[PDB]
């Protein structure tokens, strides 16, 4: 059976009943694959210029990652789908902003 396992930097659609939230994956494949969990930050088209926002370019829709809302999600149980990947520079900005809070 072929199944998607997320990589660091992947932009995924996380499901929930109904129904999905876009998110950027922060943890590596090995951890994600072994545990069925992954750390990520949610995305939203509702940009407000909040300082923890990181603009994501060249995606289907214009949007931003909310770096301060780091979340451990059960991607395997919920059933995630890959939508794309963020640029290395965008992932560095997300990680640099998270570092201010829990580094």
């Amino acid at each position: 059976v072929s199944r998607y396992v997320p990589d660091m930097g992947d932009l995924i659609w996380v499901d929930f009943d109904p129904g999905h939230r876009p998110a950027v994956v922060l943890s590596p494949f090995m951890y994600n694959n072994k545990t069925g969990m992954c750390l990520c930050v949610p995305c939203t088209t509702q940009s407000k210029g909040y300082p923890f926002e990181v603009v994501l370019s060249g995606q289907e829709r214009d949007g931003v990652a909310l770096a301060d809302q780091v979340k451990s999600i059960a991607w395997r149980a919920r059933g995630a789908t890959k939508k794309g990947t963020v640029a290395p520079e965008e992932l560095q900005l997300i990680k640099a902003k998270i570092n201010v809070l829990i580094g």
Binding site: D7, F16, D17, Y50, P51, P88, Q92
Partner: protein, 75 residues
């Protein structure tokens, strides 16, 4: 260790086993530097990254730009 240069989309690229990538502290989506010397293509991690302070980010938070906590829902 033998690998190859192949065409990935519009660009040449070289495959590396996950165990090696992991052994070198690199991850998928990491930026790297490729400075060439003599006859061996060189590839290394980047040391410089954006740096922010707690004060500069928190001071820019306002009641108007604050976001509510995302409702992740349930499976």
């Amino acid at each position: 260790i033998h690998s190859s240069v192949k065409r990935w989309g519009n660009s040449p690229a070289v495959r590396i086993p996950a165990t090696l990538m992991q052994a070198l502290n690199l991850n998928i989506d990491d930026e790297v530097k490729i400075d060439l010397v003599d006859g061996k293509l060189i590839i290394e991690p980047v040391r410089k990254e954006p740096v922010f302070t707690l004060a500069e980010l928190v001071n820019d938070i306002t009641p108007e730009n604050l976001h509510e906590n995302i409702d992740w829902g349930e499976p």
